[PDB]
Curated annotation (Swiss-Prot), chains A, B, C, D:
Residues 1-182 are annotated as: Beta-trefoil domain. The keyword Disulfide bond applies. Forms a heterodimer with BinA. It is found in: Spore, Perispore. Processed by proteases extracted from mosquito larval gut. Component of a binary toxin active against Culex and some Aedes mosquito larvae. This subunit is responsible for localized binding to specific regions of the host larval gut. The individual subunits are not toxic. BinAB and this subunit alone bind to the gastric caecum and posterior midgut of C.quinquefasciatus larvae. Binary toxin internalization into host gut cells requires both proteins. Does not bind to the midgut of Aedes aegypti. Toxic to Aedes atropalpus mosquito larvae; mortality towards both C.quinquefasciatus and A.atropalpus is maximal by 48 hours. Residues 208-389 are annotated as: Probable pore-forming domain. Its main location: other. It comes from the Bacteria. Has an N-terminal beta-trefoil domain and a C-terminal pore-forming domain. The trefoil domain has barrel and cap subdomains; the cap has 3 possible carbohydrate-binding modules while the barrel is involved in host cell receptor binding. The gene is binB. It comes from Lysinibacillus sphaericus. Belongs to the toxin_10 family. This is Binary larvicide subunit BinB. Keywords: Disulfide bond, Sporulation, Toxin, Virulence.
Length: 389, 389, 389, 389
C-alpha cells in the first residue's frame, strides 16, 4: 500500500500575502528626491495642505514601516510598526472635497479599509500600486507635491491609465526597505482520545488540568484586534505582530465517584461557559461563544471572521445570544447489584491566545454539554446504565 | 551578517484551500442509507421531482467526485471529476419557485457560482456545510427526500439555525471519500541578466531560441478555463486538474550587425504581438495582452483574474484594446570612425502553458518595445551612440 | 533592501530518511507465496533451522512492521512496532557457522547495527535491498527456504551480483505495507533577551518559573533510547516513535536585593547542576552534562550522538567528569552612597523531553556560572560596580 | 477515507547541512584584529611560515568565502567561491613535521577531505569549530600567529580541552559573513505510463523525442565534480554551486510496423548505451553506467556516490565493466491471418544534467533491453504473439 495504515496529523494552514507579513517603507514611484510616507513631526510645507498631529505625513525623512493586514474581502488595514495605529479616511473635508488620511486606533470601521490596486506607467512599463476607497470611487494621493513635505489624502479626482495624466503620479507607490512581521508557528493537529473509561473501581480518571488536548485548529490574529495590556504598542506590533489563537479539545471531567450497589447520589454538573469568561474573551479579542457554540465577532475582529474561523475549524455563530453557564443538580441511581465506578466527561472547546514567544496570554473554555458521556468500570453489557432521576 | 551577501531566489506561491485540491464525494449529513450527489443514469423516484439527463442526481450509488475551484470573491465553481462539467443553477422553474441544479459546460456566468457556508446541528453539535446562491437568498437542497433517489435544486425556503427545522436537513452536506487533484509544481523565480552586451566585433549575441529565461511568476489555472483539445475531458480533469501558466522574461533580439564606420543601414524591427498569437491565447485561455501590456480576461477566466495576475506578477489590463504588432523600418547611421558591432534587444514577456507532466502546451510572447536597448562593442564612452534616422 | 531590517527566526532541521519514518512490512523479493519477516508464535518448519521465542521468524502470516532508525555512521537499528525490541546478531552459532538474528531490548551494541545495501536482479533489473553486518562480511538471509516458515540468520556465504547465484534470493527484501512513525513537530528558534536589568529600586526582576525561554535547538530521539515508564512498549513505539528533546536558554536568577548604601550582604549562589538531576538524565536518556558543559552519551544513546548534538546546537563533551553543583557563599559590599537594587542571573541551559502530544516528560537544567552577570538600578556610569569579597 | 483514492506524486529530497549551502568567511575565534582565511596575494609576515602562490593564507583583508560540500562519510571538501579550487593537505613538510594547506583543483583524494569538529572555550563557554585530518591525528592551525599575516597548516600537536592550552587558539574558527550557494529546485516525481499500446493499424506510436518522461529521482551535484567548460570557474561556483542530475524513465521505441498476415520482417534493434555516450558521462561527471545498469563512480565523484544514488533512486553498480551497445538483427514472423500493427519499446533510463537556470547541459540514456515489450493492434487474445526467429 501507497499510504500509511494509520492516521497521520495534518499541518494547519493560515496563508497570508507577503505584504501582510512585512512592514514596508512605502515610497512615491515618481518622486525625484526620496519622498514617501513618513512619521515626521514637522508640518506640511504647502498652502491648502494643512497638517496636524493626526495627519499621515509625506516626507523624505523619518519613514513609516507599514504592514497591510488582509481582511476577508481582500481589502487591507494599513498599520504602523512603531505605534500600532492604522490609516483612517477621516470624514472631515479639506479643499476640493478631499478627505485627509489620519492615524487612528483600530476600530474595524469601513473608513479604515483600503483596496490595493496594482497598476503601472503606460509609457515606461514600470509597475506601482495604488490605494482606493469607497468601491474605487476615491484614490489615496499626496496633497499637491511629489517632492516636498505634505499630507496624504483621498480624492475623487481619478484619471484613466490612458491618456496619462500628471495627477496620477501623486497616487503611485512602490515598496522599499522592510522589517519582517513576528509571526507564531502554527501547531500540528492531533487526535482526540475516546472519552476516558475507568479501568478499575479505584480509577478516579483524569482532571481537566491533566487532560491531553487534541489540537484541532489555529488562527493568526493581527495584533490590532488583540488587547494585551501587558505589552506596550511598540512591543506588541514589533514582537507579536500576529498572536496565535489555538483551538483544542479535551475531555473535561464533571465528576468521578464509586456509586455503591443500589445507592443514590446527587451531583452538581457545571457546563457551558461563565459570563466572566465570555466578558474576558470580548475584552481581549472582541469575540465570544454563541449559544450555538459557534464564534461571534464584534466589530474589531469582524473583518477577519472568515479567515479566523476557517483556521480554527469552528463555525461562525448564527445567534447573537451568548452561550450561558449551565449549573444542574443531577440525581443518579445505580440499580446494579455491584459497586460501579462512574465518571462523567463533556467535550471542552478550549481557545488559547499565545504570544510569538509561546507565552500563554489566556485560555477560554466552553464545556459542551451536547457532547458528553458517562463511562464506568464495570460497564455494559455487564452492568445496566446508570439511571438518571 | 545574518542574511546572505547575494540575492537568493524566492518560492512562487499559489495558495489554495484543501477543497480546491481534492474531488470529494459529497454526502447528505442526515441520510440514514448513504445518499449523496450522484451521476446515476436512473431517474428520480419522486413525483414533483422530475429528472432528465441534465439533472444533478441524488442517490446512494454511483457517487460524483467534485472539486470546488476557488473564485477571487471566495465563491466556488463545483466541477465533476469524470466529465469536467460544472453545477449550474438553471433559470427554469420546478414547482414552488425552485430551480433545478444541472450539469453544464463551464461559462463563468453567475449561475455557476456557489457560496459554501459552514454550519451544523444546533442540538447535536455535529458540523456540515451548505451551498447558497444569490447573496444567500437561495440554498441548495435535495428535492423532498433524504433517503430516496431524487434531484438537486435551489430554493428560497431557508430556515434559521434555531428553532431547528426539518427542511434544513435536505441542505446539509459533508465530505466523504476523495481523489487528489493533479497539480503542477510551481517553479522557483530566477533573475534576468542585463541586456546582452557584445564582447567583440564578431559577437552576434543571443537569438530568441537560445536566450535564458528569468522565471518571474506563475499561476495555477483550473482546467475548466483551459481549452486543450489534445486531451479528452476525463484526462484533463483527472491528470491536469490545474495547468501551470508560467510568466518568464528574456531579451529578445531584434537584430545584430556590424555597422561599418560612417555607414547607414536600414533594419525592420518587429515588436508587440501578432493578432494570430493574441487569437490563440483567447481560444486557449480566454485571455489576451492589453495595449497597456496588462492581462485582459474574458468571461471564462475572469472569475480567477485576481488570483492569476497575483501569481504571474503582471497587472490587470485597464484597456479593452488588444496589444498590436509593431513593424517599423529603422534607419541607422554609425557616425563613429570605426566599425561597431551593434545589437538591439527588447524585453520579451513570455507566458507558457504547461501540463502537470511538464509538457509545453503553448507559449505566447509579447515583445515589449517600451523596454529595449542597443548595446555595442566598442561602446560608450569610446564611441558615440548610434544615430537613428 | 532585499532582506528584512530585523533578525528573523530559523526553522530547526532534523532530517531523516523515509525508512526511519515508517514501520514497513519487509517481504522477500523472490517468494512466490507472500513470505517475509513475521512475529508468528508458530515454530520453524525446517530441520537445521531451529526456532525459539527469541528468533526473528519468516512466514506468510503475522507480519512485523519495522522501522529503521538511522545511526550517525549510516547503519540502522531495526526496531519492531509492536514490542519495541530490535534485531540483534546473536553471538551463538547455528550450523554452518551462521548466527541467528534474535529480538532483544536495545543496547546500542555493535551486534544490533545493520548496513542496508540497495541491489537488484542482474537479469530482470528489479531492485531490492539487503542487510549486512561486520563491514559487509556477513549478509542477513532466510534459513534455507523462500516459501516455508523458517528463521532469519546472518551468513558469511555471500555471492557476487554476477553470475547470479540462487542463494542470494534468500537475502532479498522489498518494502510492502507500512504505518507512519509518530514524530513531534520541531519548534522554531527564538532569540534570548539581554540579561534583565532592573528599572527601579522596587523591581525584583524575573524568577526562573516566569523567565522567557529562547528556543535554540531540538533533536528527535528514537524512542529506543528513551526510558519513559509512564507508557508501555507498544504505546511508546506507536504514538511516540520519536520524542522531542528541546534545547532552550533563559536567565536564571541567583538573587535580587536592594543593597543599601555602604552595606554588606552575604548571599548563597547555587549554579551548575545537581547529581540528582544528572542521575535522572542518565536514567531517562543515557546522557549527562560534562564538566565542559557539553553533552556526554552512554552506550544506549551514543550511536545517535552526532545527529542529536547537531540538532541541539550544543557540543559533544570532551570530558567524562560530570558537571557538578556549585554552592558558593558570596559577600557583597555596596560602596555607593545610594541604595542600589542588585540582581544576579546566570545563563540556564534547559533540556526538555516531550511526547508527540506535547506533554512534558522532564526538564533538566545546567546553570552556567561561566555566563553570568549582576545588573542594577541605578547602574554604571552613575554607580560603581558592586564589590565582591 | 482519510487518504486519496488515487496515487499522488512525492517530493524528491536531497537534504544538506547549512554549511554546504553557504560560502562562509571563516574567522579565527581568538584574533583581536579580524584575522581569518584569506586570498591575499601578499606574502607571509613570519619566519618559519613561508608562503607561495599555493598557500592558504591567513590575513585580516581579502577574505575567502568557503563552502563545505558534504561527503558520504560526513567529512567535507572545503571549496573557494572565487576560483572553485579546494583545500588540500599537501604531503610536503614545513618545520616541525607540519604540512601546508594549499589550494588545488578537486581530485577527490583523501588529502582533500576534512573532518569538522564543534568545540569551544572551557573557561568562557564560547563555541567554535576545528578541522581535523587523518582520523583526528592532525588539526588545521594558523602557522604561529593569531594577528599577523601567515599560512594555514596541519599539525599533529593537538591539546585536550582541559587544561586549556594557548596553541589551541590557532585552530579555532567561527563563521562570519556569507553568500548563499545557487541551488537547483528538485523536481517532483511523476508516474510512468504503461508501455504504449497501438489503437489502430495506422497508429505508429511514440518516437523517443516525443515520449513523456516520468521523473523518478534527482541529485544535487557539487560543481567541483562537474566539468562544464561552457562556464568559467567563477560563474560555475557562484551561479551553479550545485548542478541538478535528474533520473527519468520513458518508453523508447525500437520500431513500429504493420506486419502483414503471414509475412516476415527483419528489423535492427539497438539497445544498451554507446561507448561515445559512456565516455561523455565519464568526462562530464566521472560516472558511467555499469553492465548491471547501476551507477559507477570514478574518484572525482566517488565521495558523494551514496548521496547521489540515494537521490537518483538507482543503485550503485557492482561491476567495473561498462554497459555496452547491443545491436541485434531480429527476424519476426506474423503467423496470424490478419495484418497486425506491431511496436516494440524498451525502458530508457535517462540522466539529465541541468544548470540552476534550468538549461540542459547534457542527457545520457541507457536503453534497458531487460525491460522491453512488443504491443500491437489487434492483440491477445484476438491474435497470437509475434514469433521471433
Amino acid at each position: 500500500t501507497n499510504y500509511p495504515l494509520n492516521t497521520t496529523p495534518t499541518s494547519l494552514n493560515y496563508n497570508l500575502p507577503e505584504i501582510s507579513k512585512k512592514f514596508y517603507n512605502l515610497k512615491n514611484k515618481y518622486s525625484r528626491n526620496g519622498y514617501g510616507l513618513s512619521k515626521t513631526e514637522f508640518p506640511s510645507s504647502i498652502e491648502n495642505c494643512p497638517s496636524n498631529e493626526y495627519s499621515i505625513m509625506y516626507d523624505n525623512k523619518d519613514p513609516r514601516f507599514l504592514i497591510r493586514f488582509l481582511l476577508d474581502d481582500g481589502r487591507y488595514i494599513i498599520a504602523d510598526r512603531d505605534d500600532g495605529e492604522v490609516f483612517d479616511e477621516a470624514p472631515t473635508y479639506l479643499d476640493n472635497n478631499n478627505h485627509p488620511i489620519i492615524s487612528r486606533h483600530y476600530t474595524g470601521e469601513e473608513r479604515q479599509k483600503f483596496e490595493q490596486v496594482g497598476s503601472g506607467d503606460y509609457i515606461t512599463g514600470e509597475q506601482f500600486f495604488q490605494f482606493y476607497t469607497q468601491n474605487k470611487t476615491r484614490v489615496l494621493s499626496n496633497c499637491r507635491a511629489l517632492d516636498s513635505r505634505t499630507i496624504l489624502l483621498s480624492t475623487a479626482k481619478i484619471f484613466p491609465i490612458y491618456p496619462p495624466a500628471s495627477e496620477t503620479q501623486l497616487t503611485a507607490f512602490v515598496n522599499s526597505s522592510f522589517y519582517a512581521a513576528a509571526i507564531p508557528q502554527l501547531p500540528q493537529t492531533s487526535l482526540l482520545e475516546n472519552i476516558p473509561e475507568p479501568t478499575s473501581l479505584d480509577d478516579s480518571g483524569v482532571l481537566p488540568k491533566d487532560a491531553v488536548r487534541a489540537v484541532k485548529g489555529s488562527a493568526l490574529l493581527p495584533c490590532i484586534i488583540v488587547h494585551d495590556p501587558n505589552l506596550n504598542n511598540s512591543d506588541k506590533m514589533k514582537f507579536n505582530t500576529y498572536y496565535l489563537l489555538e483551538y483544542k479539545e479535551y475531555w473535561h471531567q464533571l465528576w468521578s465517584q464509586i456509586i455503591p450497589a443500589h445507592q443514590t447520589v446527587k451531583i452538581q454538573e457545571r457546563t457551558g461557559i461563565s459570563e466572566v469568561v465570555q466578558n474576558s474573551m470580548i475584552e481581549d479579542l472582541n469575540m465570544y461563544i454563541g449559544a450555538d457554540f459557534g464564534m461571534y465577532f464584534y466589530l474589531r475582529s469582524s473583518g477577519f471572521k472568515e479567515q479566523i474561523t476557517r483556521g480554527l475549524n469552528r463555525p461562525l455563530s448564527q445567534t447573537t445570544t451568548q452561550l450561558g453557564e449551565r449549573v444542574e443538580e443531577m440525581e443518579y441511581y445505580n440499580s446494579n447489584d455491584l459497586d460501579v465506578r462512574y465518571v462523567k466527561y463533556a467535550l471542552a472547546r478550549e481557545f488559547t491566545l499565545k504570544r510569538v514567544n509561546g507565552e500563554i496570554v489566556k485560555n477560554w473554555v466552553a464545556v459542551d454539554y451536547r457532547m458528553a458521556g458517562i463511562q464506568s468500570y464495570p460497564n455494559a453489557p455487564i452492568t445496566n446504565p446508570l439511571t438518571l432521576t
